[PDB]
Structure formats: structure tokens, C-alpha cells
Ligand SMILES: *Cc1ccc(-n2ccnc2)cc1
Ligand SMILES: *Cc1ccc(-n2ccnc2)cc1
């Protein structure tokens with residue numbers, strides 16, 4: 001890769017600079033280079049990796065949705081033929097999004113996940129794996145769509161099993177995992193009841209564990225609990 | 237170029253889609269392809285070209301400023317040596333910004349400007365030429381900085397001379413040109429008095445011509461007049 | 473339905 | 482000091 005000649009520490013420093021500059025494509029390339037150095041990632045380094053790619057794919061997903069909406073209106077009854085351009089350009093963005101998801105999944109598979117032994121790292125990477133298969137599932141339509149969905153489900157499920165055994169109910173990674181798995185249930189798996197049950201149980205068990213936390217940990221946990229509550233308000 | 241195989245009309249259609257999707261790099265590449273078809277650009281097409289590159293270079297300028305600020309703080313008395321990384325990454329962004337400016341200037345020179353005979357197109361392209369030399373001037377420090385500044389000045393001046401002869405004082409292109417030339421005077425040429433005089437005279441002569449306009453043209457002109465007023469309020 | 477925004481830090 | 486924002490349309 002093009003980052004093979006840069007020091008690991010310099011890649012990390014520049015990823016932090018790119019975040020300050022809101023240059024998320026650069027940030028993702030720097031963190032990909034840092035991963036490819038082959039050493040495990042620290043807690044802060046895992047966050048940098050996640051933030052970088054979440055922003056990149058987030059822009060791609062927002063663009064894909066704009067274009068998919070235009071395409072669907074064009075294929076309505078009474079619409080004028082505009083030619084192949086809207087489909088072509090949606091496919092363009094879709095292919096670029098899939099390429100980014102494949103890149104992240106490749107980093108997790110080679111070899112972040114197999115070297116991650118602590119609950120905090122292993123759950124973090126498995127949550128990421130579920131998320132990026134979820135993003136692939138959002139655009140999937142072919143022979144493999146069901147397999148993509150099950151790959152997301154399987155990664156989320158393994159992360160959940162570990163987090164329930166190894167982490168307190170208020171752990172922010174455990175909470176964010178449950179939040180995203182509930183969104184998977186609602187948006188991808190057509191299981192809104194499973195989504196609601198998971199969000200409620202996650203919220204109630206975190207509520208009952210708040211008394212054990214410092215003021216700073218309380219702030220971290222209650223922030224994500226409010227996202228669970230926001231979804232429950234939208235879903236019920 | 238990679239757009240050589242796409243129809244001109246398809247490039248224009250996709251540039252409009254990219255704007256809706258906020259995919260400004262794509263938008264700029266589509267419009268570069270449309271320019272390279274060799275036909276003159278319509279009023280709407282010139283706007284698409286301008287919007288695309290203004291957004292691309294706008295993100296680069298915002299990032300360059302963030303990084304230049306970090307770099308200047310690092311080179312202060314009492315700061316810890318962080319190594320070459322901040323300078324290296326600022327240079328990275330700077331070089332990419334210069335590449336975009338060179339690309340736009342190349343399109344204007346080959347061959348938009350020489351084929352532009354109407355006042356509305358010629359002033360529009362010369363304003364663009366002044367703007368992109370201004371962006372080069374913002375980052376310039378070497379043997380050529382004075383020549384870059386004079387290239388900006390010369391393009392703006394030719395656009396001003398044409399606009400004063402050929403356009404009413406409320407014309408939005410004439411107003412936006414005067415606005416940006418006044419920013420050039422203030423920010424680049426160290427001539428704040430020239431900047432203030434130009435903004436005031438531009439505002440007063442537009443004010444006196446508003447009575448000739450329709451309600452829609454009045455809205456277009458008064459919007460840019462308010463930007464002139466905002467600057468005058470900041471400068472005086 | 474909001475996932476972890478996860479866009480900062 | 483603001484130039485033409487010119488980022489829309
Ligand atoms: C996936 C994920 C979980 C939790 C956080 N977070 C935000 C603030 N503290 C922890 C981010 C991402
Ligand atoms: C350079 C420039 C001048 C004027 C406009 N404008 C905005 C709205 N109407 C006209 C944009 C760019």
C-alpha cells in the first residue's frame with residue numbers, strides 16, 4: 001500500500017490531524033496504513049479507525065439514498081424516460097460504497113479480529129464487522145443478499161454473546177453494539193419486535209447499573225441510553 | 237480523460253445529480269468532462285462548473301487553514317517538537333489544492349476564455365480566473381507569489397472593465413465579481429482602503445439601479461448587495 | 473432510526 | 482471577509 005513507507009506513529013498522528021481537518025478519506029487511508037503495520041490497535045487507535053470509515057461510508061450512504069430516491073421516482077407510472085444516467089450514477093456510488101465496506105471487512109479479517117483477545121477489542125471489531133455487512137445489506141439485491149444479512153447477524157450475535165459475559169451493562173461499547181444490532185433488526189431483518197425488545201432490555205439493564213459509575217462514565221453511558229430511548233420513541 | 241466516452245448531455249445530467257447528492261468531486265469531474273467536449277457552456281452549465289469546483293477547493297482551503305494554524309502553533313516558542321508530520325500533511329493538502337486550481341485555470345485557458353464573446357460568459361470566466369489565482373495566492377510563499385497575485389489582479393481587472401462597460405450595476409455577476417475583487421484587495425493585496433472603496437461604490441451604484449428590476453431580479457441583486465454590506469460592516 | 477453516530481473522536 | 486459563497490445551484 002501507499003502508506004508502507006510511513007512510520008506507524010506518523011500515520012496515527014496524521015489520522016488525528018485529518019480528523020481535525022475533516023478530511024475523512026485521508027484519515028481512513030492513514031488508519032488503513034496503520035492497521036497494515038501488523039500490530040494490534042490501542043483503544044484510541046480503534047476509535048480512530050472506526051470514526052474514519054464511518055464518516056467515509058456515511059457520506060456514500062447519504063448519496064446512495066438521494067440517488068436511489070431519484071431512481072425510484074423515475075421508474076414510477078407517468079415519469080419521463082431520462083435514460084440510463086440516474087441508474088448508472090447510483091451504481092457508481094453503490095460500487096464505491098461496496099468497495100469501502102469490503103476494505104474495512106478485509107482489515108477486520110486480515111487480521112484484526114483473530115488477534116483480538118480482550119473483550120473490549122474483540123467486541124469492538126465484531127460490532128464493526130456487523131455494521132459493514134449491514135451497510136452492504138442496505139444496497140444488496142442479488143443472489144447473496146440473504147447471506148450478507150446473515151453475515152451481519154452472525155457478527156453482531158457473537159459480539160453480543162461476548163459483551164453480555166464480559167462487560168457491565170453500562171459499557172459504552174456494549175451499549176452501542178446493542179443499539180446498532182437493534183437497528184439491524186428494525187431496518188434490515190424486518191424484525192421490529194426484536195428491535196424494540198432489545199432496545200428496552202438494554203436500556204433497563206443499563207439504568208439499573210448507573211449507580212456504580214463515576215460522573216464521567218455516567219455521562220458516557222447515559223448519552224448512548226438516550227439514543228436507545230430516541231429509537232424506542234420512534235418505533236412505539 | 238476518463239469522461240471522454242460519456243455523452244456531453246449525460247455528463248451535465250450527472251453533474252446535476254452529483255450536486256443533489258453533495259458529491260462535489262464527482263460533480264467537478266463530470267463538468268471537466270463536459271468542458272473537454274469543446275463546445276461553449278450555457279449560463280446554467282457555467283454555474284454548474286463554478287459550483288462544483290468552488291465546493292471542492294472550498295473544502296481544501298478549510299482543511300489547509302486548520303493545518304496551517306496547527307503548524308504555526310507548533311513553530312511557536314515553547315512548543316514541543318512533533319516532528320515533520322504537521323508540515324508534511326499541510327504540504328499534502330496544499331499540493332492537492334494547487335492541483336485543483338491548476339486544473340480549473342487550465343480549463344479556462346484551454347479554451348473557455350478565448351471562445352467567450354458575450355459579456356456574461358467572458359466576465360464569468362475572468363472572475364473565475366481571478367478567484368483561482370486568488371486561491372493559489374492564499375498558499376503562495378516562493379519566488380512566484382507576486383506573479384500569482386498579479387495574475388489574479390489582472391484577470392479581475394479585465395472582468396471589471398468589461399462589466400462596467402457591458403452590464404447594469406445590479407447584474408449579479410458584476411456584483412459578485414466586485415465582491416470577490418474587494419476581498420482580493422483586503423485579504424491578498426494588503427489594500428483595505430481599495431477594498432472598502434470598491435464595496436461602497438458597488439453597493440451605492442446597485443442601490444440606485446434597483447428601481448429598474450423585476451421582483452425576482454431585485455431578490456437576486458439585493459442578496460449580493462447584503463454580502464457587500466456585511467464585509468463593509470466587518471471592515472469599518 | 474439512529475445507529476451510533478460515531479463520526480467524532 | 483466573505484466572498485461569493487457560490488456553493489449552491
Ligand atoms: C460503537 C460505539 C459505541 C460507543 C461509542 N461511544 C461514544 C461515546 N462514548 C462511546 C462509540 C461507538
Ligand atoms: C460569482 C457569482 C456571482 C453571482 C452569483 N449569484 C448568486 C445568486 N445569483 C447570482 C453567484 C456567483
Ligand SMILES: [Cl-]
Pocket residue numbers: 088089092250
Ligand atoms: Cl456514472
Ligand SMILES: [Cl-]
Pocket residue numbers: 014324325328
Ligand atoms: Cl502526508
